[PDB]
Amino acid sequence: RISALPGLNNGQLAEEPLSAYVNALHDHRLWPPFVTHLPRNMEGVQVVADRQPLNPANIEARHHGVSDVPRLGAMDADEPLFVDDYRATDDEWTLQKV
Amino acid sequence: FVDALKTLCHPVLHEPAPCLQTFTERGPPSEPAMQRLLECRFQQEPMGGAARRIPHFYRVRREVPRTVNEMKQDFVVTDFYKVGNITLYTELHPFFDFTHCQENSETVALCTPRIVIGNLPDGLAPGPFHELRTWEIMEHMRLRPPPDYEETLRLFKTTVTSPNYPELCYLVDVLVHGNVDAFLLIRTFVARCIVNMFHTRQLLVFAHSYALVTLIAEHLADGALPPQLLFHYRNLVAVLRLVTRISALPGLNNGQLAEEPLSAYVNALHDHRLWPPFVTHLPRNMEGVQVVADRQPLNPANIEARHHGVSDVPRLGAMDADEPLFVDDYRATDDEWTLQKVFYLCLMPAMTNNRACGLGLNLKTLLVDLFYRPAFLLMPAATPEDSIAAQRQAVGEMLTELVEDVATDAHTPLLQACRELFLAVQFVGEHVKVLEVRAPLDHAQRQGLPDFISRQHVLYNGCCVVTAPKTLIEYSLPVPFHRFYSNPTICAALSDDIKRYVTEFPHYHRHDGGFPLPTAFAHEYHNWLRSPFSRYSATCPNVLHSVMTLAAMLYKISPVSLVLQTKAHI
Amino acid sequence: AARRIPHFYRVRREVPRTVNEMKQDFVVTDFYKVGNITLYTELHPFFDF
Amino acid sequence: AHEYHNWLRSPFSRYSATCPNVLHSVMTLAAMLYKISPVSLVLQTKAHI
Amino acid sequence: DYEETLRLFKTTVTSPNYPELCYLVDVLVHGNVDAFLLIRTFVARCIVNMFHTRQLLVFAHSYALVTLIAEHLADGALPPQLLFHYRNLVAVLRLVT
Amino acid sequence: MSLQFIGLQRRDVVALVNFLRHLTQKPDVDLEAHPKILKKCGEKRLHRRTVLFNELMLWLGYYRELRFHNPDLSSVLEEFEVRCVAVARRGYTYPFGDRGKARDHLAVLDRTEFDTDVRHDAEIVERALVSAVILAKMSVRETLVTAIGQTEPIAFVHLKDTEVQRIEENLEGVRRNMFCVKPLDLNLDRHANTALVNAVNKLVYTGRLIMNVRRSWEELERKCLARIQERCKLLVKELRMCLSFDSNYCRNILKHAVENGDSADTLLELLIEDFDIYVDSFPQS
Amino acid sequence: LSSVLEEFEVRCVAVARRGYTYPFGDRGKARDHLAVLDRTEFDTDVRHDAEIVERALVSAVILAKMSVRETLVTAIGQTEPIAFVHLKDTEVQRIEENLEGVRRNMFCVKPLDLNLDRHANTALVNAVNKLVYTGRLIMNVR
Amino acid sequence: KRDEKHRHVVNVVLELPTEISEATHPVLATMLSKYTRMSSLFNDKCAFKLDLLRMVAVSRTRR
Amino acid sequence: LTPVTMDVNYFKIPNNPRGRASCMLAVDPYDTEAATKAIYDHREADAQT
Amino acid sequence: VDRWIRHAAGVERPQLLDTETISMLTFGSMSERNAAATVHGQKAACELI
């Protein structure tokens, strides 16, 4: 309630929220240096770990609590990266930045 | 102004027709850039089970265009005069509020008078100018240094704002329905929840509801509580008495016209025509008001016929179904009805910054899935409590997640604690419903649009809610029915469709008036409240003074109200 | 009169107020204005009329 | 209703409806209680109250 | 200074919390010195039992009680602060005269 | 709706049913008119809670037919405005000493109407007694009272004394069994007296009829609520003395306010329909 | 028809005498139905009686809504529904059983123990309830 | 005769455990008449269950 | 008026008390639609303020 | 974006509509844009960030 202007903000430009155009603390494109998940909005983002963009679904998979030998033997491996559900919302992602 | 009373009070000032007719002759503006303002669907809908039909409105992806008053509100007081404003024609009369509603295959204007003085846009009545007027009303009351009631209000920055707010309060606040008799049974146990949560959370229980604090300040005043914790509750009632003692007062003069007191024409907080967003019992007087429910009004008294505390099978099957509605009594005295306006409509939005929002519950499947257990089904009380794990198996999972740390003392077994809430099962109220209200304007203001009738909605069987339970979440029924009490955040955690509307349109995350009302409730233009209220509530502090200034925005603009306000040199 | 007092309240008829109460309502500078209707009530300070 | 002949009058209780609660109201009520009698004005005048 | 008692005074007389029994007490005693002389153990037992829980002091409603609470109950079985309150009120009434 | 009672013998219960079925048909319609029927309830003869409960049923049962036969001002008042029009049309014809003693009462005489509420009837017919009755004295030049603060007398004028003895017996029968007034045997009109007075006398007769009916009716209903409030307070205070589920359920039935007999009419069906469940609550013999 | 025909106009004129003193929003919405309210009498022929009664259902029932001021059949060409005004549903389901019971045996009626009068209701409504009920009775007979 | 009806109420509607019986807890035996005389809304289950549930809450009280 | 109205400009310098200064001396002679646009229209700001 | 800017800036050459066809005898070019009220002289301002 200081990084944005809720009393002035209204509506949206394009599909993206208008507040994201006001501050880098709210738009999905910026990331905090430490991130335990992924942003809900991949639209403008293209993550990479080695070379090619990590867009295809084969790059991402995860499965907690049932034990995964291929994951344990590939913990050293750079790719594919593993990630859980995109539970974070843009508000929780904003506090994730803050 | 006392010399100007010979002019300002004259009837010709208050008739819409000379203004509204020329305003219609001008027509909608021809300029395309202003055409974006024109859209606004003010469609009326029946209020028959709509409280459960609300999510279906949120299933659609369609955006809701903002109302013309919502667009005018955004500007700074100096930008309001600038050519960049496109809403200059919207308000040709401060007492009124012209607009261009878009009826289907039509574009007819919809005039509607403003009522309370705070309906004016911030370019007319900015906050900083207005709180200084509240200092003047406090000055005329000979109370410029406010009494040191702030120490309890500092707790409201914690107790009502807290995410950690206990879920037992929703259960007690539902079951009591404001009845004195529920406190007469639970008084031996309800205080234990307060001393325990204050021992843990260091915050008073049951801040959310006026109905509970009003009687715990009286019926539980005897013992049950340590003197300081009870002192906070009586201090809160003293704060509400401070609101009614600043609200207007016939300390200038009293008297009456037609029938209504003069100490009611000057403020909406006094006259019965205004209603609190939440209600537990109907006001003792209902003249000039019609409680429509379905397409036909529920107004006639033949429908009501409560017989509370008695086993009534057809009545127990009547819940979820709308009519016949019923209430035990017109319990609200005009004083208690006045403080009931002071609470949910003024104090709570001022302290939560228009955050917390209420919700209903499906008592049928709730109590059947909760109670009905064999330990409740068979509880002789002449004149497995042994191992604590066995009594935890007997109370079930939900009682272990609700009762233990939240309530019972170590001396009290969980069985003895849940029997106390089991005594309240006899107070079975009706399922949550929305009562549409239509109150025609009083004759002092009726001359402006004589055919007009103020339109309202009230959450009957509703309850104040901050953070919805995560254990009772299955039966939660979110109801963002009003500008006050409208929380997209917690509401997204309930029905998934609201979270869908938020993830598609994040900017409606704001707690103010920017979150759309459902078209069943999108009659804010006819509402007694307007945009500046709750939008100021999003930015108001918590000193105490904001609760005063919200009442100062509540002053009526009736010509008789202009007379009495003029008499005090206000 | 100590016992029969409620019987006076049983009637629904209103009881008009005395001039001594009506005169007080005016604000200090407002009291001297022509709109005062009780100017002749107070020809003397010690003695009301 | 014969309060119009009573020693106390309309202003007092209306003054007590909003009187300060610090301590001063108990003093100012006696300050308004001083008699108008000419002998009261005589003894009061010498002390320049 | 006398206002510190007056805060407790406004707390005790304005409150809806204020107990019912005192109204029967003032009607029963009628201010006689011998009544306080024979009921002093009871009225002192009430003031000590109730001040701890009600916070606000009891029997502030009438001059007939407090005038002789200073003369009889002060001999013992009361906190010094409470007798400071009753002596405060008597000093205020003497300050008014 | 079948009646229910505890310790009463079947002959007493049937006596109460026949007491109700012909209640308005019975002479002197009042519970005080038959004190022995109050003794038929078995006070002292039965247990205290059973006596207060059966007596409370007797008061609600006495109230059952006050809702039924009802006041019937329709056919009676329909001729009241007709006789008042006869007093007016006859009244314009007769010169007086001056119109200033009559023009105000003559104006009220034709401005009479009937407000929608029945309670305003006291303001209606009584104003005609303020008017037309004085006009009969003005026909005879009788000395009406002049003193300020003296209420104007209201009585029949220039009727034969035995005719007053009969018509007052008719009004006394209206004071008793109001529901069966029966037309008078002796016609008020007389050739010796001027018709200008006799038409006013018939107007006074219909006015005494509507007054005696509505006033005895309001006295009966207000006494009914005054006694039902006593039976409800005494029964709740007595049931409170001994906690029990069957007694507390009846206390929940009695939580409702005594005020207004419409909710009491729902209270009768609410109570008699559940009469079986709490029969154990009342000891007998 | 005798005793039934006698008191119907009596209750109808009773609704009229109750209605003269109450102002409305405009007399023109009511004065026409009030004109039908009084001029009607009774033709000796039995078959015409339904025409005598059905016009009263067009009249006072709308006036009962005017006693509460409520939306009515504004649409042109719509036949007006006719039902008892402002009464609890249990009274309706019982009174309809009494009407069908009169249909089972018109020669013996015996009025139902329940009373249409309600102190919470305006007397203007209760008189319309007795009037419509007598109209349902004569309609069931013919 | 009536035993099949009371068994229809205790089982098909109330879903009471077999250990509970009309001869066990008195309030059910007092309510067997009101449950029998009614016929509507047998399709509902929560109604009669909540009715006996709240009525047991009335069955024991100190105030 | 609006209480927020500027005083340092609108009230100190002379101007039309209409709240929108205008003159036929400023408007083009022999004109109507653009002349009424100079006064009652708002999208085109007037001179002075 | 560019469509949204036109509202926040208030600038739009089409918004004038160039007074096509319906102009009353006055110049159709209207000397490009032209203010209707002109109590003062021609405007002149620029800015350097």
Side-chain angles (χ1 to χ4, degrees), chain F residues 242-263:
Chain F
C242 296
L243 279 65
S244 293
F245 167 74
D246 52 1
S247 176
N248 289 334
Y249 177 81
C250 298
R251 297 175 63 184
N252 295 332
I253 304 295
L254 268 65
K255 293 178 67 62
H256 299 290
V258 182
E259 185 180 359
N260 188 28
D262 189 10
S263 298

mmCIF file of all heavy atoms in Angstrom, chain F residues 242-263:
data_model
loop_
_atom_site.group_PDB
_atom_site.id
_atom_site.type_symbol
_atom_site.label_atom_id
_atom_site.label_comp_id
_atom_site.label_asym_id
_atom_site.label_seq_id
_atom_site.Cartn_x
_atom_site.Cartn_y
_atom_site.Cartn_z
ATOM 1 N N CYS F 242 -39.266 -25.504 39.447
ATOM 2 C CA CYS F 242 -38.780 -26.872 39.297
ATOM 3 C C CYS F 242 -38.336 -27.088 37.856
ATOM 4 O O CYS F 242 -39.175 -27.184 36.954
ATOM 5 C CB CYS F 242 -39.856 -27.883 39.693
ATOM 6 S SG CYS F 242 -40.347 -27.806 41.433
ATOM 7 N N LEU F 243 -37.023 -27.158 37.640
ATOM 8 C CA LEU F 243 -36.489 -27.400 36.307
ATOM 9 C C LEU F 243 -36.878 -28.786 35.807
ATOM 10 O O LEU F 243 -36.773 -29.779 36.531
ATOM 11 C CB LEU F 243 -34.965 -27.258 36.305
ATOM 12 C CG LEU F 243 -34.334 -25.862 36.230
ATOM 13 C CD1 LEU F 243 -34.633 -25.018 37.466
ATOM 14 C CD2 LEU F 243 -32.833 -25.980 36.013
ATOM 15 N N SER F 244 -37.315 -28.845 34.552
ATOM 16 C CA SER F 244 -37.655 -30.091 33.878
ATOM 17 C C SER F 244 -37.808 -29.799 32.394
ATOM 18 O O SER F 244 -38.190 -28.690 32.010
ATOM 19 C CB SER F 244 -38.941 -30.708 34.441
ATOM 20 O OG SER F 244 -38.765 -31.140 35.779
ATOM 21 N N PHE F 245 -37.512 -30.804 31.565
ATOM 22 C CA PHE F 245 -37.601 -30.605 30.122
ATOM 23 C C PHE F 245 -39.040 -30.391 29.670
ATOM 24 O O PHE F 245 -39.307 -29.525 28.829
ATOM 25 C CB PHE F 245 -36.988 -31.795 29.385
ATOM 26 C CG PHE F 245 -37.312 -31.825 27.919
ATOM 27 C CD1 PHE F 245 -36.694 -30.946 27.043
ATOM 28 C CD2 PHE F 245 -38.239 -32.723 27.415
ATOM 29 C CE1 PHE F 245 -36.991 -30.966 25.694
ATOM 30 C CE2 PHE F 245 -38.541 -32.746 26.067
ATOM 31 C CZ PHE F 245 -37.914 -31.866 25.207
ATOM 32 N N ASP F 246 -39.981 -31.168 30.213
ATOM 33 C CA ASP F 246 -41.378 -30.999 29.827
ATOM 34 C C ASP F 246 -41.928 -29.658 30.291
ATOM 35 O O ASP F 246 -42.831 -29.105 29.653
ATOM 36 C CB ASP F 246 -42.223 -32.149 30.379
ATOM 37 C CG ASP F 246 -42.026 -32.357 31.869
ATOM 38 O OD1 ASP F 246 -41.245 -31.599 32.478
ATOM 39 O OD2 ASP F 246 -42.648 -33.282 32.430
ATOM 40 N N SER F 247 -41.400 -29.123 31.393
ATOM 41 C CA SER F 247 -41.814 -27.802 31.852
ATOM 42 C C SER F 247 -41.102 -26.694 31.086
ATOM 43 O O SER F 247 -41.722 -25.684 30.735
ATOM 44 C CB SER F 247 -41.557 -27.665 33.353
ATOM 45 O OG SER F 247 -41.874 -26.362 33.808
ATOM 46 N N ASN F 248 -39.802 -26.863 30.822
ATOM 47 C CA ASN F 248 -39.068 -25.848 30.073
ATOM 48 C C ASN F 248 -39.581 -25.720 28.646
ATOM 49 O O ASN F 248 -39.524 -24.629 28.067
ATOM 50 C CB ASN F 248 -37.572 -26.168 30.070
ATOM 51 C CG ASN F 248 -36.930 -25.964 31.427
ATOM 52 O OD1 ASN F 248 -37.410 -25.175 32.241
ATOM 53 N ND2 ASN F 248 -35.834 -26.673 31.676
ATOM 54 N N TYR F 249 -40.077 -26.813 28.062
ATOM 55 C CA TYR F 249 -40.670 -26.718 26.732
ATOM 56 C C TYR F 249 -41.941 -25.879 26.758
ATOM 57 O O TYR F 249 -42.185 -25.087 25.840
ATOM 58 C CB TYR F 249 -40.954 -28.117 26.182
ATOM 59 C CG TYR F 249 -41.637 -28.126 24.830
ATOM 60 C CD1 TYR F 249 -40.906 -27.958 23.660
ATOM 61 C CD2 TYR F 249 -43.010 -28.307 24.723
ATOM 62 C CE1 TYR F 249 -41.524 -27.967 22.424
ATOM 63 C CE2 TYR F 249 -43.637 -28.317 23.490
ATOM 64 C CZ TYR F 249 -42.889 -28.145 22.345
ATOM 65 O OH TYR F 249 -43.507 -28.154 21.116
ATOM 66 N N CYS F 250 -42.757 -26.030 27.805
ATOM 67 C CA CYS F 250 -43.926 -25.172 27.951
ATOM 68 C C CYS F 250 -43.529 -23.726 28.217
ATOM 69 O O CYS F 250 -44.227 -22.804 27.783
ATOM 70 C CB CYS F 250 -44.826 -25.692 29.071
ATOM 71 S SG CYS F 250 -45.488 -27.349 28.782
ATOM 72 N N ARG F 251 -42.418 -23.509 28.927
ATOM 73 C CA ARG F 251 -41.921 -22.149 29.100
ATOM 74 C C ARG F 251 -41.481 -21.550 27.772
ATOM 75 O O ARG F 251 -41.646 -20.343 27.553
ATOM 76 C CB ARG F 251 -40.769 -22.132 30.104
ATOM 77 C CG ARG F 251 -41.161 -22.575 31.503
ATOM 78 C CD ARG F 251 -39.949 -22.660 32.416
ATOM 79 N NE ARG F 251 -39.302 -21.364 32.597
ATOM 80 C CZ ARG F 251 -38.184 -21.175 33.292
ATOM 81 N NH1 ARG F 251 -37.580 -22.203 33.874
ATOM 82 N NH2 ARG F 251 -37.668 -19.959 33.403
ATOM 83 N N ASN F 252 -40.931 -22.373 26.874
ATOM 84 C CA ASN F 252 -40.608 -21.891 25.535
ATOM 85 C C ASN F 252 -41.867 -21.549 24.749
ATOM 86 O O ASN F 252 -41.842 -20.645 23.907
ATOM 87 C CB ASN F 252 -39.779 -22.933 24.784
ATOM 88 C CG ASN F 252 -38.414 -23.155 25.408
ATOM 89 O OD1 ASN F 252 -37.854 -22.257 26.038
ATOM 90 N ND2 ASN F 252 -37.869 -24.354 25.234
ATOM 91 N N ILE F 253 -42.967 -22.262 25.004
ATOM 92 C CA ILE F 253 -44.244 -21.896 24.405
ATOM 93 C C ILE F 253 -44.730 -20.559 24.951
ATOM 94 O O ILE F 253 -45.370 -19.780 24.234
ATOM 95 C CB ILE F 253 -45.277 -23.016 24.639
ATOM 96 C CG1 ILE F 253 -44.760 -24.352 24.100
ATOM 97 C CG2 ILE F 253 -46.605 -22.678 23.984
ATOM 98 C CD1 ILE F 253 -44.583 -24.379 22.598
ATOM 99 N N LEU F 254 -44.418 -20.261 26.211
ATOM 100 C CA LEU F 254 -44.883 -19.051 26.878
ATOM 101 C C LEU F 254 -43.914 -17.881 26.757
ATOM 102 O O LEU F 254 -44.172 -16.825 27.345
ATOM 103 C CB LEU F 254 -45.165 -19.336 28.358
ATOM 104 C CG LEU F 254 -46.602 -19.734 28.714
ATOM 105 C CD1 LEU F 254 -46.991 -21.068 28.089
ATOM 106 C CD2 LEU F 254 -46.795 -19.771 30.221
ATOM 107 N N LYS F 255 -42.804 -18.041 26.031
ATOM 108 C CA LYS F 255 -41.860 -16.938 25.879
ATOM 109 C C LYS F 255 -42.477 -15.766 25.126
ATOM 110 O O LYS F 255 -42.037 -14.623 25.290
ATOM 111 C CB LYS F 255 -40.596 -17.414 25.161
ATOM 112 C CG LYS F 255 -39.752 -18.395 25.955
ATOM 113 C CD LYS F 255 -38.550 -18.865 25.153
ATOM 114 C CE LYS F 255 -37.571 -17.730 24.918
ATOM 115 N NZ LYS F 255 -37.021 -17.210 26.202
ATOM 116 N N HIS F 256 -43.485 -16.029 24.299
ATOM 117 C CA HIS F 256 -44.085 -14.990 23.475
ATOM 118 C C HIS F 256 -44.855 -13.981 24.319
ATOM 119 O O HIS F 256 -45.442 -14.314 25.353
ATOM 120 C CB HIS F 256 -45.005 -15.615 22.431
ATOM 121 C CG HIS F 256 -44.297 -16.538 21.494
ATOM 122 N ND1 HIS F 256 -43.405 -16.089 20.545
ATOM 123 C CD2 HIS F 256 -44.336 -17.886 21.367
ATOM 124 C CE1 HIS F 256 -42.930 -17.119 19.868
ATOM 125 N NE2 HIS F 256 -43.479 -18.221 20.348
ATOM 126 N N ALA F 257 -44.845 -12.732 23.862
ATOM 127 C CA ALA F 257 -45.510 -11.654 24.578
ATOM 128 C C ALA F 257 -47.023 -11.843 24.573
ATOM 129 O O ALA F 257 -47.605 -12.329 23.598
ATOM 130 C CB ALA F 257 -45.146 -10.305 23.957
ATOM 131 N N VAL F 258 -47.656 -11.458 25.684
ATOM 132 C CA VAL F 258 -49.112 -11.522 25.793
ATOM 133 C C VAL F 258 -49.776 -10.529 24.845
ATOM 134 O O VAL F 258 -50.922 -10.733 24.422
ATOM 135 C CB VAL F 258 -49.533 -11.283 27.257
ATOM 136 C CG1 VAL F 258 -51.043 -11.392 27.423
ATOM 137 C CG2 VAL F 258 -48.821 -12.260 28.181
ATOM 138 N N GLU F 259 -49.072 -9.459 24.478
ATOM 139 C CA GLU F 259 -49.673 -8.380 23.705
ATOM 140 C C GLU F 259 -50.135 -8.868 22.336
ATOM 141 O O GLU F 259 -49.484 -9.706 21.704
ATOM 142 C CB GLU F 259 -48.674 -7.233 23.543
ATOM 143 C CG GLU F 259 -49.241 -6.002 22.858
ATOM 144 C CD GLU F 259 -48.216 -4.898 22.709
ATOM 145 O OE1 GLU F 259 -47.068 -5.087 23.163
ATOM 146 O OE2 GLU F 259 -48.557 -3.842 22.137
ATOM 147 N N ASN F 260 -51.273 -8.328 21.889
ATOM 148 C CA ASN F 260 -51.915 -8.655 20.617
ATOM 149 C C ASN F 260 -52.417 -10.094 20.596
ATOM 150 O O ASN F 260 -51.645 -11.037 20.795
ATOM 151 C CB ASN F 260 -50.971 -8.406 19.438
ATOM 152 C CG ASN F 260 -51.668 -8.541 18.097
ATOM 153 O OD1 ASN F 260 -52.873 -8.320 17.986
ATOM 154 N ND2 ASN F 260 -50.911 -8.908 17.069
ATOM 155 N N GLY F 261 -53.713 -10.271 20.341
ATOM 156 C CA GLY F 261 -54.298 -11.596 20.331
ATOM 157 C C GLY F 261 -54.093 -12.379 19.056
ATOM 158 O O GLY F 261 -54.447 -13.561 19.010
ATOM 159 N N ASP F 262 -53.535 -11.752 18.019
ATOM 160 C CA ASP F 262 -53.240 -12.484 16.792
ATOM 161 C C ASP F 262 -52.145 -13.516 17.029
ATOM 162 O O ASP F 262 -52.278 -14.679 16.633
ATOM 163 C CB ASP F 262 -52.838 -11.511 15.684
ATOM 164 C CG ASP F 262 -52.718 -12.185 14.330
ATOM 165 O OD1 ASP F 262 -53.130 -13.359 14.204
ATOM 166 O OD2 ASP F 262 -52.211 -11.541 13.388
ATOM 167 N N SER F 263 -51.055 -13.108 17.685
ATOM 168 C CA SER F 263 -50.023 -14.071 18.049
ATOM 169 C C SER F 263 -50.549 -15.087 19.052
ATOM 170 O O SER F 263 -50.113 -16.245 19.052
ATOM 171 C CB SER F 263 -48.799 -13.349 18.615
ATOM 172 O OG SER F 263 -48.222 -12.484 17.653
#
